[PDB]
Design an enzyme around this catalytic site. Structure first.
Site, PDB file in Angstrom:
ATOM      1  N   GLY A 157      33.560  39.475  31.209  1.00 30.20           N
ATOM      2  CA  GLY A 157      34.162  39.617  32.534  1.00 30.20           C
ATOM      3  C   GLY A 157      35.650  39.901  32.437  1.00 30.20           C
ATOM      4  O   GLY A 157      36.440  38.998  32.143  1.00 30.20           O
ATOM      5  N   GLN A 158      36.007  41.195  32.600  1.00 29.94           N
ATOM      6  CA  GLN A 158      37.361  41.792  32.523  1.00 29.94           C
ATOM      7  C   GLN A 158      37.503  42.742  33.714  1.00 29.94           C
ATOM      8  O   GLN A 158      38.609  42.929  34.230  1.00 29.94           O
ATOM      9  CB  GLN A 158      37.553  42.595  31.216  1.00 29.94           C
ATOM     10  CG  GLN A 158      37.597  41.773  29.932  1.00 29.94           C
ATOM     11  CD  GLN A 158      36.710  42.371  28.866  1.00 29.94           C
ATOM     12  OE1 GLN A 158      35.494  42.540  29.040  1.00 29.94           O
ATOM     13  NE2 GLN A 158      37.299  42.703  27.728  1.00 29.94           N
ATOM     14  N   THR A 207      36.881  43.422  37.492  1.00 29.42           N
ATOM     15  CA  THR A 207      36.987  42.775  38.823  1.00 29.42           C
ATOM     16  C   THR A 207      37.098  41.227  38.720  1.00 29.42           C
ATOM     17  O   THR A 207      37.893  40.643  39.473  1.00 29.42           O
ATOM     18  CB  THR A 207      35.927  43.237  39.887  1.00 29.42           C
ATOM     19  OG1 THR A 207      34.584  43.181  39.386  1.00 29.42           O
ATOM     20  CG2 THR A 207      36.224  44.626  40.455  1.00 29.42           C
ATOM     21  N   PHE A 208      36.370  40.581  37.770  1.00 35.97           N
ATOM     22  CA  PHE A 208      36.502  39.154  37.653  1.00 35.97           C
ATOM     23  C   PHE A 208      37.510  38.744  36.567  1.00 35.97           C
ATOM     24  O   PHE A 208      38.068  39.586  35.827  1.00 35.97           O
ATOM     25  CB  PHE A 208      35.154  38.417  37.552  1.00 35.97           C
ATOM     26  CG  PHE A 208      35.078  37.423  38.707  1.00 35.97           C
ATOM     27  CD1 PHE A 208      35.689  36.172  38.615  1.00 35.97           C
ATOM     28  CD2 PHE A 208      34.517  37.788  39.929  1.00 35.97           C
ATOM     29  CE1 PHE A 208      35.708  35.294  39.709  1.00 35.97           C
ATOM     30  CE2 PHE A 208      34.522  36.900  41.020  1.00 35.97           C
ATOM     31  CZ  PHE A 208      35.111  35.658  40.900  1.00 35.97           C
ATOM     32  N   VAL A 257      35.213  35.329  31.998  1.00 40.03           N
ATOM     33  CA  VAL A 257      33.817  35.007  31.651  1.00 40.03           C
ATOM     34  C   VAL A 257      33.579  35.333  30.185  1.00 40.03           C
ATOM     35  O   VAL A 257      33.876  36.449  29.758  1.00 40.03           O
ATOM     36  CB  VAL A 257      32.768  35.690  32.565  1.00 40.03           C
ATOM     37  CG1 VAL A 257      31.369  35.141  32.330  1.00 40.03           C
ATOM     38  CG2 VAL A 257      33.137  35.549  34.019  1.00 40.03           C
ATOM     39  N   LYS A 284      32.637  30.326  32.495  1.00 40.30           N
ATOM     40  CA  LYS A 284      33.508  30.930  33.515  1.00 40.30           C
ATOM     41  C   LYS A 284      34.682  29.991  33.678  1.00 40.30           C
ATOM     42  O   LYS A 284      34.480  28.844  34.059  1.00 40.30           O
ATOM     43  CB  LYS A 284      32.743  31.121  34.844  1.00 40.30           C
ATOM     44  CG  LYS A 284      33.465  31.954  35.914  1.00 40.30           C
ATOM     45  CD  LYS A 284      33.403  31.342  37.306  1.00 40.30           C
ATOM     46  CE  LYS A 284      33.528  32.382  38.384  1.00 40.30           C
ATOM     47  NZ  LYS A 284      32.225  33.068  38.633  1.00 40.30           N
ATOM     48  N   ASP A 312      23.501  29.032  32.017  1.00 39.15           N
ATOM     49  CA  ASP A 312      22.537  29.516  31.047  1.00 39.15           C
ATOM     50  C   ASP A 312      22.784  31.025  30.975  1.00 39.15           C
ATOM     51  O   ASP A 312      23.003  31.665  32.023  1.00 39.15           O
ATOM     52  CB  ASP A 312      21.112  29.236  31.543  1.00 39.15           C
ATOM     53  CG  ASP A 312      20.542  27.868  31.214  1.00 39.15           C
ATOM     54  OD1 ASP A 312      20.692  27.420  30.025  1.00 39.15           O
ATOM     55  OD2 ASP A 312      19.850  27.290  32.099  1.00 39.15           O
ATOM     56  N   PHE A 313      22.836  31.575  29.752  1.00 40.85           N
ATOM     57  CA  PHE A 313      23.116  32.989  29.569  1.00 40.85           C
ATOM     58  C   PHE A 313      21.935  33.874  29.954  1.00 40.85           C
ATOM     59  O   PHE A 313      20.777  33.514  29.717  1.00 40.85           O
ATOM     60  CB  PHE A 313      23.538  33.248  28.125  1.00 40.85           C
ATOM     61  CG  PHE A 313      23.982  34.665  27.850  1.00 40.85           C
ATOM     62  CD1 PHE A 313      25.181  35.146  28.354  1.00 40.85           C
ATOM     63  CD2 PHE A 313      23.205  35.518  27.078  1.00 40.85           C
ATOM     64  CE1 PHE A 313      25.586  36.461  28.098  1.00 40.85           C
ATOM     65  CE2 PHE A 313      23.634  36.815  26.795  1.00 40.85           C
ATOM     66  CZ  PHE A 313      24.810  37.283  27.318  1.00 40.85           C
ATOM     67  N   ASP A 327      28.451  38.734  48.255  1.00 39.53           N
ATOM     68  CA  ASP A 327      28.960  39.610  47.194  1.00 39.53           C
ATOM     69  C   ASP A 327      27.826  40.323  46.511  1.00 39.53           C
ATOM     70  O   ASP A 327      27.811  40.492  45.296  1.00 39.53           O
ATOM     71  CB  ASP A 327      29.865  38.858  46.189  1.00 39.53           C
ATOM     72  CG  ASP A 327      30.806  39.770  45.414  1.00 39.53           C
ATOM     73  OD1 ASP A 327      31.016  40.949  45.859  1.00 39.53           O
ATOM     74  OD2 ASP A 327      31.338  39.317  44.367  1.00 39.53           O
TER      75      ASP A 327
HETATM   76  C1  LIG Z   1      28.729  40.804  25.179  1.00 41.51           C
HETATM   77  C2  LIG Z   1      27.441  40.712  25.944  1.00 41.51           C
HETATM   78  O1  LIG Z   1      26.435  40.159  25.477  1.00 41.51           O
HETATM   79  N1  LIG Z   1      27.456  41.270  27.176  1.00 41.51           N
HETATM   80  C3  LIG Z   1      26.340  41.208  28.117  1.00 41.51           C
HETATM   81  C4  LIG Z   1      26.126  42.537  28.808  1.00 41.51           C
HETATM   82  C5  LIG Z   1      24.945  42.460  29.775  1.00 41.51           C
HETATM   83  C6  LIG Z   1      25.166  41.382  30.827  1.00 41.51           C
HETATM   84  C7  LIG Z   1      25.446  40.017  30.188  1.00 41.51           C
HETATM   85  C8  LIG Z   1      25.965  39.030  31.199  1.00 41.51           C
HETATM   86  O2  LIG Z   1      26.832  39.339  32.030  1.00 41.51           O
HETATM   87  N2  LIG Z   1      25.420  37.801  31.097  1.00 41.51           N
HETATM   88  C9  LIG Z   1      25.688  36.674  31.872  1.00 41.51           C
HETATM   89  C10 LIG Z   1      26.767  36.637  32.747  1.00 41.51           C
HETATM   90  C11 LIG Z   1      26.938  35.529  33.564  1.00 41.51           C
HETATM   91  C12 LIG Z   1      28.095  35.487  34.500  1.00 41.51           C
HETATM   92  C13 LIG Z   1      28.899  34.406  34.915  1.00 41.51           C
HETATM   93  N3  LIG Z   1      29.815  34.771  35.794  1.00 41.51           N
HETATM   94  N4  LIG Z   1      29.604  36.107  35.951  1.00 41.51           N
HETATM   95  C14 LIG Z   1      28.589  36.572  35.186  1.00 41.51           C
HETATM   96  C15 LIG Z   1      28.689  38.061  35.106  1.00 41.51           C
HETATM   97  C16 LIG Z   1      29.524  38.368  36.370  1.00 41.51           C
HETATM   98  C17 LIG Z   1      30.307  39.664  36.195  1.00 41.51           C
HETATM   99  C18 LIG Z   1      28.648  38.455  37.624  1.00 41.51           C
HETATM  100  C19 LIG Z   1      30.468  37.161  36.452  1.00 41.51           C
HETATM  101  C20 LIG Z   1      25.995  34.508  33.454  1.00 41.51           C
HETATM  102 CL1  LIG Z   1      26.055  33.116  34.475  1.00 41.51          CL
HETATM  103  C21 LIG Z   1      24.964  34.612  32.537  1.00 41.51           C
HETATM  104  N5  LIG Z   1      24.806  35.677  31.747  1.00 41.51           N
HETATM  105  C22 LIG Z   1      26.569  40.114  29.148  1.00 41.51           C
END
Ligand SMILES: CC(=O)N[C@@H]1CCC[C@H](C(=O)Nc2cc(-c3cnn4c3CC(C)(C)C4)c(Cl)cn2)C1
Lengths: 314, 252
Positions: free
Chosen positions: A22-23, A25-26, A29, A44, A94-95, A139
């Protein structure tokens, strides 16, 4: 205070920062790895720019909302972490491996009609949940829609989300990114509700075939014009009582435009049901715009090919 | 966790403050003083009783983790209230809370110059302390009060305005005067309050057609034995509190 007991707030050092994600708009992250288990998470950072009134009320709101919303199609806040001058706070989620904006901007990625149905189903089900819990996302955009390695869609980024209620409401008009912003907001509405998120669902749905945001305005006037060139023109006949704060009070709108939603998308979509649902989502009058409940009932989710699991891709 | 902020009497005995030589009865007084300071400031800041109540729960919970020996009530109360007002959507400005806290604590003193290093420091002390509170509570700031459940019950019992108002009074005072908020769930505490209010007002809630007592419709765990034990405890602390019972005393 340097050496104070803190049983329920762990130091973020437990997670290992792998990459900034996240670089654009946000704020801040990071993708990170639990140092013991290997569990992938997203960190975050809570931003302290001009924070003259202690811990941000905005962050307290988001945290409150994140703690309330527990659903398969809503991002999951695991915990809040600290970092032992001045010291930061992180929201741990969680990712999720992918994001709709990314998959759509990827020529190699290809969706079947069956999978597009599934994506929309999860999205609308997430929206139904959040709204049922008196929360407006505010959003809606492809980049805020995430998908797990297991093909589970999650609504993400509740930083602009807010609780809503049932004399009139004066909610902020500085809501939703321009391309996804509904007519109501562009006409200056402050007593809006769940239909704002559905307009955004419409824009995303159409994006599943066009692979690009259908209406890319530069200013509010440009956006309103673009909307008119697609959904017909803003008329008290089409939108009862639209004639109230603008329409005539500057905001120079078109007058001859006719609905081309189904014609302009006719090329990309082809499926009748998908075109009908998009048409019902991109409705001008927020009161005539389909809700998540009825959208989920739409024949698009209940005709062949029936919605299928996500394996496209990987 | 569900039982995170609920403690046994033995857990309440072996408190952080007890570890630093604070007697049980002294700790209870330190809690009562903090709740009074929160009510005094809250009134002056014109925040709701809900906001004050939320700040009182924060304080109670805060001191199940931290010691009164390290964090004085007079320092935590203003930070707890500043946080609670933000949480409960009645945000009060930092300078504002500081000015009010100062007059409550030092009526005869004069607020320092808002340009002085001594004032800039107390502004920073509050901010720091709010942060320590957020972290002690592990950012679990959404509080269920028993007032929510009293309203529900006093209607599903068809109580006079009087009975309902006496019950809300019991609920508020149970936060100031007891640690029930650290021991019993809000629906249970609500039952305790309605029960005592009935005893005080010589009101009797009749048995349901089913043969069920009123409280069985409020909380399944609740027993008359417990209700009588808890109402007696609450009544005793209320009798010790000058002019408090006067507020609900029927003189006719
Ligand atoms: C380096 C890498 O592996 N890059 C991937 C490329 C695909 C998408 C993935 C991703 O964005 N994963 C993610 C983001 C969030 C999160 C939390 N805050 N916000 C988001 C993204 C946002 C811009 C909406 C702001 C969460 Cl909670 C969980 N997983 C990252």
């Amino acid at each position: 205070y340097d050496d104070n007991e803190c049983p329920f707030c762990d130091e973020v050092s437990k997670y290992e920062k792998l990459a900034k994600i996240g670089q654009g708009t946000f704020g801040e992250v990071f993708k990170a790895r639990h140092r013991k288990t290997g569990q992938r998470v997203a960190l975050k950072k809570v931003l302290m720019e001009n924070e003259k009134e202690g811990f941000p009320i905005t962050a307290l709101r988001e945290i409150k909302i994140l703690q309330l919303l527990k659903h398969e199609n809503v991002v999951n806040l695991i915990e809040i972490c600290r970092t032992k001058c001045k010291g930061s706070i992180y929201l741990v989620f969680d990712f999720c491996e992918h994001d709709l904006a990314g998959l759509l901007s990827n020529v190699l990625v290809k969706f079947t009609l069956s999978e597009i149905k599934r994506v929309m189903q999860m999205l609308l089900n997430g929206l139904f949940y959040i709204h049922r819990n008196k929360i407006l996302h505010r959003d809606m955009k492809a980049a805020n829609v995430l998908i797990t390695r297991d093909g589970v869609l999650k609504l993400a980024d509740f930083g602009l989300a807010r609780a809503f209620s049932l004399n009139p409401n004066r909610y902020t008009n500085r809501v939703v990114t321009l391309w996804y912003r509904p007519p109501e907001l562009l006409l200056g509405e402050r007593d809006y509700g769940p239909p704002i998120d559905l307009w955004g669902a419409g824009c995303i749905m159409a994006e599943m075939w066009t692979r690009s945001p259908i209406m890319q305005g530069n200013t509010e006037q440009h956006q309103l014009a673009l909307i008119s060139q697609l959904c017909g023109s803003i008329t008290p006949e089409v939108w009862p009582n639209v004639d109230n704060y603008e329409l005539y009070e500057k905001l120079e709108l078109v007058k001859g435009q006719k609905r081309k939603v189904k014609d302009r998308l006719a090329a990309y979509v082809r499926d009748p049901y998908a075109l009908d649902l998009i048409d019902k989502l991109l409705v001008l009058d927020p009161a005539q715009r389909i809700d998540s409940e009825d959208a989920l009932e739409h024949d698009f989710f209940w005709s062949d090919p029936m919605p299928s699991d996500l394996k496209g891709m990987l | 966790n569900n039982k995170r902020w609920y403690f046994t009497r033995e857990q309440l005995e072996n408190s952080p403050s007890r570890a630093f030589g604070v007697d049980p009865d002294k700790e209870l007084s330190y809690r009562q003083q903090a709740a009074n300071l929160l009510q005094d400031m809250g009134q002056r800041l014109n925040v709701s009783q809900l906001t004050i109540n939320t700040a009182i729960v924060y304080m109670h919970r805060f001191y199940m983790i931290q010691s009164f020996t390290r964090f004085p009530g007079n320092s935590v109360a203003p930070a707890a209230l500043f946080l609670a007002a933000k949480v409960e959507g009645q945000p009060k400005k930092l300078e504002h809370v500081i000015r009010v806290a100062h007059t409550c604590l030092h009526p005869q003193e004069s607020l320092p110059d808002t340009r002085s290093e001594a004032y800039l420091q107390q502004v920073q002390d509050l901010v720091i302390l709010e942060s320590i509170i957020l972290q002690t509570l592990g950012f679990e700031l959404t509080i269920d009060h028993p007032h929510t459940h009293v309203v529900k019950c006093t209607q599903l019992v068809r109580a006079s305005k009087d009975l309902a108002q006496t019950s809300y009074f019991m609920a508020t005072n149970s936060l100031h005067l007891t640690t029930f908020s650290l021991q019993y769930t809000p629906p249970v505490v609500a039952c305790v309050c309605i029960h005592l209010a009935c005893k005080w007002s010589n009101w009797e809630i009749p048995v349901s057609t089913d043969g069920k007592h009123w409280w069985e419709y409020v909380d399944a765990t609740v027993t008359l034995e417990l209700l009588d034990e808890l109402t007696h405890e609450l009544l005793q602390i209320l009798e010790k509190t000058p002019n408090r019972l006067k507020r609900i005393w029927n003189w006719r």
